[PDB]
Amino acid sequence: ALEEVVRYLGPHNEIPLTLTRDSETGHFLLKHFLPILQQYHDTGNINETNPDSFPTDEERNKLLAHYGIAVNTDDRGELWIELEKCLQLLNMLNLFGLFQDAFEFEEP
Amino acid sequence: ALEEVVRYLGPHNEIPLTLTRDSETGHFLLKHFLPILQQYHDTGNINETNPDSFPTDEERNKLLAHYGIAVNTDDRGELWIELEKCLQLLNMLNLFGLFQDAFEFEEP
Numbered sequence A, B: 001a002l003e004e005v006v007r008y009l010g011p012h013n014e015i016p017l018t019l020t021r022d023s024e025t026g027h028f029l030l031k032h033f034l035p036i037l038q039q040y041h042d043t044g045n046i047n048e049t050n051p052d053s054f055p056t057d058e059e060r061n062k063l064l065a066h067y068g069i070a071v072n073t074d075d076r077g078e079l080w081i082e083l084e085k086c087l088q089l090l091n092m093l094n095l096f097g098l099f100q101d102a103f104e105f106e107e108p
């Protein structure tokens, strides 16, 4: 099953970032990170992100190579990342704080 | 009721970090964080935390002040921290991954 939370940023909270986690693999869906990651690469200011602007596959190749992001692949060919890299990206982008309020303790 | 999870670190798994949550307040016990927090402050390397040491109240004052940690107090005078502060500290110490199975997304 999929587990999902969304938060918003930008001066008018119009830029979404969705964390989509697969319950079986524990991985996060890569696609949701790409518009913000590309804007960060281009100008260093994620508040400028156009959320409708998605990198082409050619642009995605260059982002994965530059940031040293490894991906897992599902049966349909869609790309996912590990929790550890997800957290590293949130911290790089200064977005951990935006998601602090999204987690709840569950006694294993 | 109290809910608890413990994980270990250091070269011989000799350093414990215990998360103790009160299910009525949602807060976590402060004291368990102090040995690792003091070591992080001193050398930035938590893997060299001395399992034998425990910070005095005077040392505790300094850590709470420096890291800007607010505390809640119970009827016995024991000190507790908020869920969001617990998450912030795990992130800062790069221990969120270690406790990943103890945290899930909020309900939508």
Ligand SMILES: C[As](C)(=O)[O-]
Residues within 6 Å of the ligand: B078
């Ligand atoms: C909450 As207690 C009295 O076990 O430190």
Ligand SMILES: [Ca+2]
Residues within 6 Å of the ligand: A030, A031, A079
């Ligand atoms: Ca993708």
Ligand SMILES: [Ca+2]
Residues within 6 Å of the ligand: A101, A102, A103, B106
């Ligand atoms: Ca919440």
Ligand SMILES: [Ca+2]
Residues within 6 Å of the ligand: B030, B031, B060, B079
């Ligand atoms: Ca204490």
